Amino acid sequence: LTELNFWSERAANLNSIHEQLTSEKTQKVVKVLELAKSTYYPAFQRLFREVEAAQQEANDNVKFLKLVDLFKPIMHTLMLIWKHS
Amino acid sequence: KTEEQLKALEDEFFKTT
């Protein structure tokens, strides 16, 4: 299941890096660097903007995603998933 | 010579709201 595991991994990894970047020592590093205020810090601002929306949207679709003769009614579930999603 | 499956899947989608 490449798609399901792909987006689950994306949500987990990006949340983990998102509090690798919002944690305490990183915050002190950003302010100690902000005793210089030259150029780089708007670039990390925009890259944090890259982080947050992808993080939350990955979380949303992870919460959404949660013999075959006997298992055609399961296909109704599939249409209903496409119906519901 | 399957109504209850519909309703329950609606319920589980509403649990994921």
Side-chain angles (χ1 to χ4, degrees):
Chain A
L1 305 175
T2 55
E3 197 277 346
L4 283 72
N5 287 345
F6 191 85
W7 269 38
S8 81
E9 187 277 331
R10 176 169 213 80
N13 203 10
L14 269 294
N15 284 261
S16 174
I17 311 288
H18 179 268
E19 286 83 5
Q20 197 193 280
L21 65 89
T22 43
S23 79
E24 56 86 19
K25 176 72 144 180
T26 79
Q27 269 161 337
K28 264 74 72 181
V29 169
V30 173
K31 275 75 77 182
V32 170
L33 294 174
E34 273 151 351
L35 278 77
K37 298 297 290 294
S38 68
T39 59
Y40 275 72
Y41 316 134
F44 315 100
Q45 287 164 6
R46 155 180 56 52
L47 297 168
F48 297 152
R49 291 188 275 270
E50 280 189 352
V51 188
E52 181 65 27
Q55 173 203 16
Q56 49 82 11
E57 172 48 0
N59 304 343
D60 275 3
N61 285 131
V62 167
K63 92 182 173 67
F64 279 177
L65 272 295
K66 71 179 309 174
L67 288 73
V68 189
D69 194 16
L70 195 59
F71 300 140
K72 66 186 71 62
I74 298 171
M75 299 177 221
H76 296 89
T77 297
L78 269 53
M79 88 199 170
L80 288 154
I81 289 176
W82 280 35
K83 273 192 189 200
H84 292 171
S85 81
Chain B
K1 285 172 201 155
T2 70
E3 180 59 39
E4 61 82 18
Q5 308 173 1
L6 296 172
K7 288 180 172 182
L9 195 152
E10 194 260 6
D11 298 343
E12 64 87 20
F13 176 56
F14 269 73
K15 292 155 212 153
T16 53
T17 51

